[PDB]
């Protein structure tokens, strides 16, 4: 989704795009977009900038820049989700949730998971390590 970023982040991106596209026509050149991203702290490499441009006249509009940045936002969200999955077991401090702890966590998740689903997830992969839980969640 294009609205993955927070409201403050979206406002900052819009301000940067407006500053880069000072002509008021919305279209912003690739060099201008890169300069705006660097000024906002999201300075990407030349190959990364080319890949982002390809994924998203010689100019890119503000909605196009938002769509391109949405990919990085989704990647950051996925990384945060992976970190949360890895640290779910480390939250208790032991680092290796037991079978009862894993069942309790699965019940607390409430993602339409029954006893059979929990058993299948455990079998797919007896204490469950944090790394093992993260790998199972990644699938």
């Amino acid at each position: 989704m294009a609205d993955q970023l927070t409201e403050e982040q979206i406002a900052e991106f819009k301000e940067a795009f407006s500053l880069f596209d000072k002509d008021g026509d919305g279209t912003i050149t690739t060099k201008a977009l890169g300069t705006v991203m660097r000024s906002l702290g999201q300075n990407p490499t030349e190959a990364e900038l080319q890949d982002m441009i390809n994924e998203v006249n010689g100019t890119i509009d503000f909605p196009a820049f938002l769509t391109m940045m949405a990919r990085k936002m989704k990647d950051t969200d996925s990384e945060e989700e992976i970190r949360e999955a890895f640290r779910v077991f480390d939250k208790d401090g032991n680092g290796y949730i037991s079978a009862a702890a894993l069942r309790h966590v699965m019940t607390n998740l409430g993602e339409k998971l029954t006893d059979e689903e929990v058993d299948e997830m455990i079998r797919e992969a007896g204490q469950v390590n944090y790394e093992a839980f993260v790998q199972m969640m990644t699938a």
Partner: protein, 48 residues
């Protein structure tokens, strides 16, 4: 009146295996991938 009632009662659908399978597969996903809940209240049942 008779023609309208015939059309209305012929329009009514019947049980479909494909529709039931589609409903089951859709219900297989409990919620959205991220930042969303698949309530499916409007969809309800794909058949009947």
């Amino acid at each position: 009146f008779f023609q309208s009632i015939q059309a209305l009662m012929q329009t009514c659908s019947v049980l479909d295996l494909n529709a039931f399978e589609r409903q089951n597969k859709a219900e297989g996903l409990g919620m959205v991938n991220e930042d969303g809940t698949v309530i499916n209240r409007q969809n309800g049942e794909k058949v009947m």
